Amino acid sequence: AGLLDGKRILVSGIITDSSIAFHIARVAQEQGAQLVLTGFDRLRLIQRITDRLPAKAPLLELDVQNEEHLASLAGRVTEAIGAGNKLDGVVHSIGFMPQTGMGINPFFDAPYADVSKGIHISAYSYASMAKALLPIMNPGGSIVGMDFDPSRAMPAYNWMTVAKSALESVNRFVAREAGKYGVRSNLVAAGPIRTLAMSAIVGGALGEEAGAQIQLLEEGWDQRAPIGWNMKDATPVAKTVCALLSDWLPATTGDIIYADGGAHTQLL
Amino acid sequence: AGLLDGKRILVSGIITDSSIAFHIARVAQEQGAQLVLTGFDRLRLIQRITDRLPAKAPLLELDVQNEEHLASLAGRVTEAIGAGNKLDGVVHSIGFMPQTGMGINPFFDAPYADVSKGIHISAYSYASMAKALLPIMNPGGSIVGMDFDPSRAMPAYNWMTVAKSALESVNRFVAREAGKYGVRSNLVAAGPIRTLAMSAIVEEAGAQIQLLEEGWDQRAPIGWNMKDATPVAKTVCALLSDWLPATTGDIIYADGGAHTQLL
Amino acid sequence: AGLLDGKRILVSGIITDSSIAFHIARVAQEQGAQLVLTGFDRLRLIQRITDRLPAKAPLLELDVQNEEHLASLAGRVTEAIGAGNKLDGVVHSIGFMPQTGMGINPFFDAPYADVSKGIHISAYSYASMAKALLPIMNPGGSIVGMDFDPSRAMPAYNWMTVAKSALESVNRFVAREAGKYGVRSNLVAAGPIRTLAMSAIVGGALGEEAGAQIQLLEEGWDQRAPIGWNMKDATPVAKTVCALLSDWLPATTGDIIYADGGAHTQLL
Amino acid sequence: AGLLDGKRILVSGIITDSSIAFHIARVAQEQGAQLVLTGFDRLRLIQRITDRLPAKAPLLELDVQNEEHLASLAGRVTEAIGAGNKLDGVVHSIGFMPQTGMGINPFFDAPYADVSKGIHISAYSYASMAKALLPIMNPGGSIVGMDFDPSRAMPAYNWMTVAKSALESVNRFVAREAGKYGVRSNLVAAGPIRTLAMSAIVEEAGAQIQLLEEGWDQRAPIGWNMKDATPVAKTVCALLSDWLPATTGDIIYADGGAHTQLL
Ligand SMILES: NC(=O)c1ccc[n+]([C@@H]2O[C@H](COP(=O)([O-])OP(=O)(O)OC[C@H]3O[C@@H](n4cnc5c(N)ncnc54)[C@H](O)[C@@H]3O)[C@@H](O)[C@H]2O)c1
Ligand SMILES: NC(=O)c1ccc[n+]([C@@H]2O[C@H](COP(=O)([O-])OP(=O)(O)OC[C@H]3O[C@@H](n4cnc5c(N)ncnc54)[C@H](O)[C@@H]3O)[C@@H](O)[C@H]2O)c1
Ligand SMILES: NC(=O)c1ccc[n+]([C@@H]2O[C@H](COP(=O)([O-])OP(=O)(O)OC[C@H]3O[C@@H](n4cnc5c(N)ncnc54)[C@H](O)[C@@H]3O)[C@@H](O)[C@H]2O)c1
Ligand SMILES: NC(=O)c1ccc[n+]([C@@H]2O[C@H](COP(=O)([O-])OP(=O)(O)OC[C@H]3O[C@@H](n4cnc5c(N)ncnc54)[C@H](O)[C@@H]3O)[C@@H](O)[C@H]2O)c1
Ligand SMILES: CCNc1nnc(Cn2nc(C)cc2C)s1
Ligand SMILES: CCNc1nnc(Cn2nc(C)cc2C)s1
Ligand SMILES: CCNc1nnc(Cn2nc(C)cc2C)s1
Ligand SMILES: CCNc1nnc(Cn2nc(C)cc2C)s1
């Protein structure tokens, strides 16, 4: 009766109970999926958070910037799901851009070392995760990444927008590779969601004007979205990621599904 | 258990067993949906074809160019599904373009009366179907239309491509209206499907319709079987479900990913 | 010294001194072009307007819905420019949508007979003009149409947006045809300009809420446009149309140049 | 009389007589522009090549990865054009992607250190050039970068396509900055050009680079000559002129119209 009954899915990106990945994982488990979770740096925090999910799931360490973590990932994942078992789904819910590349800091003042760390984690890592997990993925499988529509320039998002543009391009290429395994690669372009970092930004953490600009963006989103947009609810986004992990979008790859209330299709 | 369990869906566009709508209806019924089918002109042919679907479904007449058929549609639909029952889903799988606007006929030789009939049936009727069925649709509902990616010009499709461009624009506006009812409006841009309209209605056209399938399969990272409408039908059901709840005025590409690749 | 020195250009769409076509024609003449002007219905009004252009230009009647006017157009144009002379440029600055298809009238209440008149004049006519004038056009030539970005739904524009979406598609096809003559076909997607009809709309002619919605759109345009947007100045749009009529965009066809202050590239 | 009469334009990216920048510079000078040229690494080779341009132009060193070169650029440029003079135009014709990220090497085998060098030179440097030259640019000015349409994935281009996608995003942001100075920022998405970087830097690669030209010419309604950079160079000059005054954060396609057609 579950949308993902008997599916083995890797879910990365859980840091808090407000992370999009926390809701992707919760909905996937509600839908019968058996999960493997990857965490970065704060493994003690991630453990106490992931324990509050509907079901038990092994937690593995994964710094996408660590080439040893990536090289050992498939072996570690196979150990957690059992020899002879493969993944049906992979969720990349990873994004990061240093403070110099987002907020009130002038767009021209982001040092390249920072932008490069940001593009490494936010875009390149999508291809790294794919390279590492495709050898242990089943035909009919699904790789899903989290995107924020970068088609147009926005205030404050700055170099994260640039990283999303790179991620969109990476995805179309990952799909060419994924296809050889009978696996789909897609992105979910979500509307803005109130994660801990996002509430902090809106509160003025990256400067006041950045907070005010994002608040206008969030307000405008809901105004344009024909069915509305509730940034305080990550479940519609999580439900969309599950739809892509399911067998119900079998002919969609190298693509982007917009879980944004339809705001991107409206000007005013 | 099914993806569309206890959902009341209207499905238009069944003419043959090869119609995309025939497969949309078959998959929806396999998925627990209770259907209402609309048909055009050849109602005797349609009833016979639809009797081959997995389950019984009332068949209603609908010429989208007939303003009386549209004006009475909701009342007729309510009669078929029972008073106090509303639709959860609407499938617009309607397209037509006279021969002068699609094929070997030069793009410049399509008379406007023909292009106009084509845009009426292929684009404007998407808004007509919504106007007529939104009053009898439930919050959480879904309106789904069939599209063929018109972003770039292509040989033979000519004015049907122009009509698809109009349909995509109509859809974004239908979504503004649909939203007031808590209903989503979206299109499925399918890869080419060897429906009879495709082969039969649309010289060495045999190798032409074979080559189209082959070229598309190459571009598609996951491939493309022009003889198989089921992946398209599954994508339509995904939009009719509760699993794409924040997607409206949009296009989902059920094309194997061909549109995302240059070669 | 003129961008269009010794070029023979047909310019359609002059109705008032505020028409985009009036400024396209004025800039083209300032740039050395020899013009042929087409007018619709109000030929007495068009004559007294076009007389206030920098130079004399023959005025011909053209109702794009009249198949006789179209069938005789090339012959009439050849008569005005002289036997043995051909056009180097064609400007389609024609658009119309009945009141039922624009404004506060509900989108669902536009009768098809009206939408059809609108798509006939606004989209189909681009291909009609091309069909009629390509036989009398020189290699290196340029067909230019006026567009308003229809990528996203907007309030009030309603069925005119639908017609622009059709026009964009028509253009890509016209370019396939035009190419056989060595002629380019493109559109200029202009930001909103304060023509007589537009000021009337903003004033509340198609209902108050439509006027208010358009005023917000115009305000937002200038806000998003990185170089600003002055709807009261049609010269930047006219200069863009001339750029496409010139030999300086020789490898651009079936395309759209955005003379919108760059507003379409910015979200907020 | 010329399209760029009395305009002071910086032109970067000349390495050979086949470089797009060599033709951009030649056409700009033919059009009355007074140029400042920037070169990377092989300055002896570049000075010799640029001595073949229609007119004398000072050549300055610029490694876009060198923060000292960038920090001193405006001061060095002002010295070459005279105190009290500012730039009206800037041409960024810079691109690089190590072999691991472009060609037969599998997409998954490009080390990040290489992709990062590529994105630094190909995308980030567009913003670096603007940061450095906007303080010495005149209102009405123009910043123009070279792009290759990255909307869809394509064989061999791999991570350079990823870098072009980043460059298009960078451009929209550079335009927000540029706008404060009354300066436009735009990209020219060119069709393929048989520059040496193209043929030489990017087995049966001879028939590969011939077939690319032929396929593109078919798709292009007006055709495409891969051996002719002049139409691209003319499009760059159009953006550097005063004839596209309301276009910024945008892309002009100098590809013969190939991107607007599916076949
Ligand atoms: N929040 C929004 O408004 C929004 C909208 C659209 C898309 N997104 C995207 O959704 C994704 C998830 O982020 P979120 O908004 O849920 O916030 P989040 O902070 O909850 O999650 C981001 C995750 O990235 C992980 N991460 C950072 N560096 C890493 C590394 N080196 N290796 C592995 N993991 C690393 C973090 O540990 C964290 O769990 C990101 O791709 C983000 O860009 C967010
Ligand atoms: N076959 C493909 O390659 C393909 C690809 C993408 C999209 N599509 C679209 O899918 C839809 C169905 O196409 P198909 O291939 O199944 O062909 P089809 O001919 O079987 O279906 C089109 C339907 O439209 C109906 N119709 C025509 N005029 C009508 C009118 N005036 N009133 C009411 N109904 C009318 C026909 O009776 C028919 O049932 C169309 O919208 C088509 O444009 C087809
Ligand atoms: N004003 C804006 O905000 C704006 C923005 C972008 C694009 N446009 C487009 O620019 C074009 C020019 O319109 P405008 O805004 O300058 O207003 P306008 O009223 O000055 O011009 C429209 C022209 O269409 C002509 N026309 C109408 N029906 C015709 C027919 N049957 N045959 C021939 N000509 C016919 C009119 O006579 C008139 O000269 C249109 O395509 C319009 O949609 C306008
Ligand atoms: N040739 C094509 O098919 C094509 C098509 C579209 C766009 N382009 C783009 O046009 C531009 C020029 O390409 P081209 O084909 O003329 O090749 P090219 O190799 O001749 O030019 C690229 C230039 O970048 C310079 N460069 C590289 N690394 C640098 C650095 N660290 N600092 C400063 N300068 C550096 C090189 O010296 C060279 O002058 C590039 O941006 C390229 O991506 C090329
Ligand atoms: C200094 C802040 N750094 C961040 N890096 N990634 C982030 C996650 N994210 N991604 C989008 C898109 C929106 C948000 C908030 S915030
Ligand atoms: C004479 C042409 N008549 C048709 N009208 N609609 C059709 C359905 N259709 N639409 C697309 C797009 C592809 C196919 C097969 S064929
Ligand atoms: C009842 C009003 N009818 C109109 N038909 N064409 C118009 C011209 N136009 N085109 C765009 C785009 C914006 C405007 C004002 S107004
Ligand atoms: C080893 C690869 N190095 C290169 N870096 N930039 C290049 C220029 N370029 N960019 C595109 C796009 C097409 C061409 C020829 S070749």
PDB file of C-alpha atoms in Angstrom, chain D residues 2-133:
ATOM      1  CA  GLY D   2      31.816  53.157 -37.773  1.00  0.00           C
ATOM      2  CA  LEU D   3      29.433  51.305 -35.422  1.00  0.00           C
ATOM      3  CA  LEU D   4      31.906  51.800 -32.479  1.00  0.00           C
ATOM      4  CA  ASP D   5      33.361  55.227 -33.393  1.00  0.00           C
ATOM      5  CA  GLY D   6      35.313  56.771 -30.471  1.00  0.00           C
ATOM      6  CA  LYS D   7      34.674  53.868 -28.123  1.00  0.00           C
ATOM      7  CA  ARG D   8      37.359  52.538 -25.814  1.00  0.00           C
ATOM      8  CA  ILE D   9      37.009  48.741 -25.575  1.00  0.00           C
ATOM      9  CA  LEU D  10      39.038  46.170 -23.590  1.00  0.00           C
ATOM     10  CA  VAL D  11      39.306  42.837 -25.493  1.00  0.00           C
ATOM     11  CA  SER D  12      40.579  39.752 -23.675  1.00  0.00           C
ATOM     12  CA  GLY D  13      41.159  36.227 -24.996  1.00  0.00           C
ATOM     13  CA  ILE D  14      43.464  36.575 -27.996  1.00  0.00           C
ATOM     14  CA  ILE D  15      45.880  33.541 -28.094  1.00  0.00           C
ATOM     15  CA  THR D  16      45.971  32.774 -31.885  1.00  0.00           C
ATOM     16  CA  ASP D  17      44.679  34.398 -35.134  1.00  0.00           C
ATOM     17  CA  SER D  18      41.828  31.805 -34.910  1.00  0.00           C
ATOM     18  CA  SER D  19      40.623  32.984 -31.410  1.00  0.00           C
ATOM     19  CA  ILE D  20      37.065  34.454 -31.434  1.00  0.00           C
ATOM     20  CA  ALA D  21      38.677  37.490 -29.624  1.00  0.00           C
ATOM     21  CA  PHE D  22      41.043  38.066 -32.579  1.00  0.00           C
ATOM     22  CA  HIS D  23      37.967  38.541 -34.851  1.00  0.00           C
ATOM     23  CA  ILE D  24      36.042  40.535 -32.216  1.00  0.00           C
ATOM     24  CA  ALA D  25      39.074  42.915 -32.027  1.00  0.00           C
ATOM     25  CA  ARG D  26      39.502  43.126 -35.844  1.00  0.00           C
ATOM     26  CA  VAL D  27      35.797  43.944 -36.417  1.00  0.00           C
ATOM     27  CA  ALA D  28      35.770  46.468 -33.474  1.00  0.00           C
ATOM     28  CA  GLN D  29      38.805  48.310 -35.002  1.00  0.00           C
ATOM     29  CA  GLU D  30      37.207  48.167 -38.514  1.00  0.00           C
ATOM     30  CA  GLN D  31      34.204  49.836 -36.714  1.00  0.00           C
ATOM     31  CA  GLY D  32      36.226  52.721 -35.230  1.00  0.00           C
ATOM     32  CA  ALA D  33      36.885  51.370 -31.724  1.00  0.00           C
ATOM     33  CA  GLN D  34      40.138  52.173 -29.822  1.00  0.00           C
ATOM     34  CA  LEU D  35      41.213  48.938 -28.072  1.00  0.00           C
ATOM     35  CA  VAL D  36      43.122  47.737 -25.000  1.00  0.00           C
ATOM     36  CA  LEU D  37      44.023  44.071 -25.214  1.00  0.00           C
ATOM     37  CA  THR D  38      44.609  41.664 -22.333  1.00  0.00           C
ATOM     38  CA  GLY D  39      46.664  38.504 -22.719  1.00  0.00           C
ATOM     39  CA  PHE D  40      47.520  35.409 -20.686  1.00  0.00           C
ATOM     40  CA  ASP D  41      50.885  33.557 -20.146  1.00  0.00           C
ATOM     41  CA  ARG D  42      52.264  33.594 -23.767  1.00  0.00           C
ATOM     42  CA  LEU D  43      52.617  37.406 -24.055  1.00  0.00           C
ATOM     43  CA  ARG D  44      55.370  37.191 -26.742  1.00  0.00           C
ATOM     44  CA  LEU D  45      53.105  35.003 -28.948  1.00  0.00           C
ATOM     45  CA  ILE D  46      50.082  37.320 -28.282  1.00  0.00           C
ATOM     46  CA  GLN D  47      51.958  40.669 -29.068  1.00  0.00           C
ATOM     47  CA  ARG D  48      53.139  39.150 -32.421  1.00  0.00           C
ATOM     48  CA  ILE D  49      49.542  37.928 -33.285  1.00  0.00           C
ATOM     49  CA  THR D  50      47.943  41.275 -32.254  1.00  0.00           C
ATOM     50  CA  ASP D  51      50.524  43.179 -34.414  1.00  0.00           C
ATOM     51  CA  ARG D  52      48.419  41.621 -37.278  1.00  0.00           C
ATOM     52  CA  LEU D  53      45.265  43.519 -36.143  1.00  0.00           C
ATOM     53  CA  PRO D  54      44.165  46.516 -38.353  1.00  0.00           C
ATOM     54  CA  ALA D  55      45.496  49.012 -35.726  1.00  0.00           C
ATOM     55  CA  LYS D  56      47.914  49.528 -32.806  1.00  0.00           C
ATOM     56  CA  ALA D  57      46.509  48.562 -29.389  1.00  0.00           C
ATOM     57  CA  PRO D  58      48.338  48.332 -26.030  1.00  0.00           C
ATOM     58  CA  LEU D  59      48.637  44.743 -24.759  1.00  0.00           C
ATOM     59  CA  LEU D  60      48.373  44.133 -20.946  1.00  0.00           C
ATOM     60  CA  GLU D  61      48.902  40.935 -18.958  1.00  0.00           C
ATOM     61  CA  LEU D  62      45.885  39.344 -17.281  1.00  0.00           C
ATOM     62  CA  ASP D  63      45.735  35.931 -15.634  1.00  0.00           C
ATOM     63  CA  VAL D  64      42.164  35.942 -14.248  1.00  0.00           C
ATOM     64  CA  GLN D  65      43.379  33.491 -11.527  1.00  0.00           C
ATOM     65  CA  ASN D  66      45.988  36.084 -10.398  1.00  0.00           C
ATOM     66  CA  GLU D  67      44.437  38.411  -7.740  1.00  0.00           C
ATOM     67  CA  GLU D  68      47.351  40.945  -8.155  1.00  0.00           C
ATOM     68  CA  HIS D  69      46.762  41.194 -11.990  1.00  0.00           C
ATOM     69  CA  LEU D  70      43.031  41.880 -11.280  1.00  0.00           C
ATOM     70  CA  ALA D  71      43.695  44.403  -8.447  1.00  0.00           C
ATOM     71  CA  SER D  72      46.085  46.414 -10.731  1.00  0.00           C
ATOM     72  CA  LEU D  73      44.053  46.021 -13.974  1.00  0.00           C
ATOM     73  CA  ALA D  74      42.030  49.327 -13.813  1.00  0.00           C
ATOM     74  CA  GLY D  75      45.182  51.331 -12.943  1.00  0.00           C
ATOM     75  CA  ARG D  76      47.142  49.702 -15.821  1.00  0.00           C
ATOM     76  CA  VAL D  77      44.162  50.172 -18.242  1.00  0.00           C
ATOM     77  CA  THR D  78      43.810  53.896 -17.223  1.00  0.00           C
ATOM     78  CA  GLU D  79      47.583  54.319 -17.926  1.00  0.00           C
ATOM     79  CA  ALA D  80      47.159  52.851 -21.433  1.00  0.00           C
ATOM     80  CA  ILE D  81      44.055  54.951 -22.383  1.00  0.00           C
ATOM     81  CA  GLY D  82      45.094  58.156 -20.558  1.00  0.00           C
ATOM     82  CA  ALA D  83      44.057  59.750 -17.238  1.00  0.00           C
ATOM     83  CA  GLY D  84      40.507  61.082 -17.453  1.00  0.00           C
ATOM     84  CA  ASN D  85      39.497  58.411 -20.011  1.00  0.00           C
ATOM     85  CA  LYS D  86      37.242  55.460 -19.243  1.00  0.00           C
ATOM     86  CA  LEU D  87      36.208  52.245 -20.990  1.00  0.00           C
ATOM     87  CA  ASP D  88      32.943  52.044 -22.975  1.00  0.00           C
ATOM     88  CA  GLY D  89      33.284  48.304 -23.614  1.00  0.00           C
ATOM     89  CA  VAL D  90      34.703  45.101 -22.059  1.00  0.00           C
ATOM     90  CA  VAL D  91      34.970  41.738 -23.919  1.00  0.00           C
ATOM     91  CA  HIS D  92      35.530  38.626 -21.818  1.00  0.00           C
ATOM     92  CA  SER D  93      36.472  35.884 -24.352  1.00  0.00           C
ATOM     93  CA  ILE D  94      38.050  33.570 -21.764  1.00  0.00           C
ATOM     94  CA  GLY D  95      37.467  29.889 -21.366  1.00  0.00           C
ATOM     95  CA  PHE D  96      39.418  26.919 -20.110  1.00  0.00           C
ATOM     96  CA  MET D  97      38.650  23.444 -18.849  1.00  0.00           C
ATOM     97  CA  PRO D  98      41.366  20.858 -18.226  1.00  0.00           C
ATOM     98  CA  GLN D  99      41.297  17.718 -20.508  1.00  0.00           C
ATOM     99  CA  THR D 100      39.818  15.610 -17.675  1.00  0.00           C
ATOM    100  CA  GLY D 101      36.619  17.730 -17.827  1.00  0.00           C
ATOM    101  CA  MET D 102      36.162  18.038 -21.585  1.00  0.00           C
ATOM    102  CA  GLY D 103      36.444  15.302 -24.342  1.00  0.00           C
ATOM    103  CA  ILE D 104      36.533  11.468 -24.293  1.00  0.00           C
ATOM    104  CA  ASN D 105      37.352  11.404 -20.561  1.00  0.00           C
ATOM    105  CA  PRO D 106      34.251  10.123 -18.720  1.00  0.00           C
ATOM    106  CA  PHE D 107      32.163  12.852 -17.044  1.00  0.00           C
ATOM    107  CA  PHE D 108      32.572  11.062 -13.696  1.00  0.00           C
ATOM    108  CA  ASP D 109      36.419  11.058 -13.982  1.00  0.00           C
ATOM    109  CA  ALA D 110      37.021  14.827 -13.836  1.00  0.00           C
ATOM    110  CA  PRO D 111      38.796  15.571 -10.481  1.00  0.00           C
ATOM    111  CA  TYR D 112      37.268  18.545  -8.700  1.00  0.00           C
ATOM    112  CA  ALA D 113      40.617  20.460  -8.666  1.00  0.00           C
ATOM    113  CA  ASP D 114      40.305  20.520 -12.507  1.00  0.00           C
ATOM    114  CA  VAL D 115      36.585  21.398 -12.678  1.00  0.00           C
ATOM    115  CA  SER D 116      37.319  24.163 -10.111  1.00  0.00           C
ATOM    116  CA  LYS D 117      40.198  25.636 -12.243  1.00  0.00           C
ATOM    117  CA  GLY D 118      37.756  25.495 -15.225  1.00  0.00           C
ATOM    118  CA  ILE D 119      34.851  27.230 -13.408  1.00  0.00           C
ATOM    119  CA  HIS D 120      37.356  29.805 -12.039  1.00  0.00           C
ATOM    120  CA  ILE D 121      38.610  30.821 -15.518  1.00  0.00           C
ATOM    121  CA  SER D 122      35.342  30.221 -17.476  1.00  0.00           C
ATOM    122  CA  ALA D 123      32.654  31.589 -15.113  1.00  0.00           C
ATOM    123  CA  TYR D 124      33.903  33.300 -11.966  1.00  0.00           C
ATOM    124  CA  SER D 125      36.381  35.493 -13.989  1.00  0.00           C
ATOM    125  CA  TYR D 126      33.457  37.149 -15.751  1.00  0.00           C
ATOM    126  CA  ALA D 127      32.516  38.684 -12.347  1.00  0.00           C
ATOM    127  CA  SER D 128      36.237  39.360 -11.580  1.00  0.00           C
ATOM    128  CA  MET D 129      36.689  41.312 -14.826  1.00  0.00           C
ATOM    129  CA  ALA D 130      33.518  43.352 -14.057  1.00  0.00           C
ATOM    130  CA  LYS D 131      34.592  44.034 -10.393  1.00  0.00           C
ATOM    131  CA  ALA D 132      37.927  45.337 -11.703  1.00  0.00           C
ATOM    132  CA  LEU D 133      36.686  47.346 -14.737  1.00  0.00           C
TER     133      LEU D 133
END
